[PDB]
Amino acid sequence: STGSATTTPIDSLDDAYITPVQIGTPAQTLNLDFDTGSSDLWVFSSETTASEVDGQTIYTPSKSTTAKLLSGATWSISYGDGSSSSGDVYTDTVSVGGLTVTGQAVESAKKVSSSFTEDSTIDGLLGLAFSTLNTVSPTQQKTFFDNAKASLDSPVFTADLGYHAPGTYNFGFIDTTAYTGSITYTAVSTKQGFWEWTSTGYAVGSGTFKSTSIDGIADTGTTLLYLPATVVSAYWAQVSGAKSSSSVGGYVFPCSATLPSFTFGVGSARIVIPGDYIDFGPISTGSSSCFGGIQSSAGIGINIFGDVALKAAFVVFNGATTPTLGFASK
Numbered sequence: 001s002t003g004s005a006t007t008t009p010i011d012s013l014d015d016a017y018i019t020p021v022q023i024g025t026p027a028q029t030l031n032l033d034f035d036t037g038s039s040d041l042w043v044f045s046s047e048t049t050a051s052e053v054d055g056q057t058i059y060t061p062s063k064s065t066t067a068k069l070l071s072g073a074t075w076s077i078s079y080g081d082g083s084s085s086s087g088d089v090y091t092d093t094v095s096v097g098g099l100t101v102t103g104q105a106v107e108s109a110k111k112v113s114s115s116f117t118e119d120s121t122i123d124g125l126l127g128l129a130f131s132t133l134n135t136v137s138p139t140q141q142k143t144f145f146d147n148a149k150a151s152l153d154s155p156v157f158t159a160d161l162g163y164h165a166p167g168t169y170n171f172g173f174i175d176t177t178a179y180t181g182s183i184t185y186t187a188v189s190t191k192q193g194f195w196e197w198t199s200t201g202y203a204v205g206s207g208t209f210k211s212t213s214i215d216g217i218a219d220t221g222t223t224l225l226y227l228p229a230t231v232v233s234a235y236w237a238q239v240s241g242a243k244s245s246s247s248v249g250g251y252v253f254p255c256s257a258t259l260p261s262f263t264f265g266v267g268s269a270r271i272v273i274p275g276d277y278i279d280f281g282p283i284s285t286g287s288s289s290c291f292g293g294i295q296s297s298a299g300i301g302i303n304i305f306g307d308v309a310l311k312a313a314f315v316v317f318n319g320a321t322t323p324t325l326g327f328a329s330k
């Protein structure tokens, strides 16, 4: 089997991407944030505290003939950005882009934190990291991908995120028309439950490539590119007037600037992030200070190749017995 679904930016900055997902019978379509940095499929629901729902589409398990309470199971998750959600669990039929999994754990939110409530465009998350991170207790549950894997033509999914445009998540096949040149594969460590890999270095603009190992995670659920402070300082030093602002919470730059590109290494290959991808616009409406798309990972504890990096590439998440990651230009 295979599946193919379009993913669409939630706003003009590409802050996140939503992908329609069919849950239950008859189908209830919710727009979920596919997150390769976590491993829970959770949704706004008829069980979510009413004051914490503001515009989201909800899953109502009582209206699904295939929903079954997973008795005694609860979940609770806290994300890197400080947001959180928790609740109980149903199993139900879940389909993405024509690919159907029966008996998928659908985690129904009883509580969500304010950042989820305040974002009316995201109806929940669909985790695509390794199932070892799944938070369901006392019986840990599998991700949608892990459940689908055996049925897939090939044990892979691909992320093809657009810059200010829709893109695609494919399951079970590699669309050889979706990228240019060849795909370069690189080793993955699953020790922390992430798609963790080591970049071979970077360049700023037309500058020389610096060969240096940068361990980080491929994370579709993180907006920005978070890298060591040395790397990030080298980038922003090439933008007149750029500075790190403790009050704003990262590097800002004059909105009048033209940003240089940023290149990262994948083995001997190179992925170029155009400067425009690094512009996250005014820090507040009407401001002439703009927020940068490359930020320091110091304090996070891990480097994160988030959407800023990933949308410059066609990315293969290879879930074979020994997982690997592939990157191609596009």
Ligand SMILES: NC[C@H](O)c1ccc(O)c(O)c1
Pocket: 016, 033, 035, 037, 038, 079, 080, 081, 083, 115, 116, 119, 122, 221, 222
């Ligand atoms: N891993 C969680 C992911 O980074 C995320 C998605 C949507 C959010 O509103 C959020 O705060 C965090």
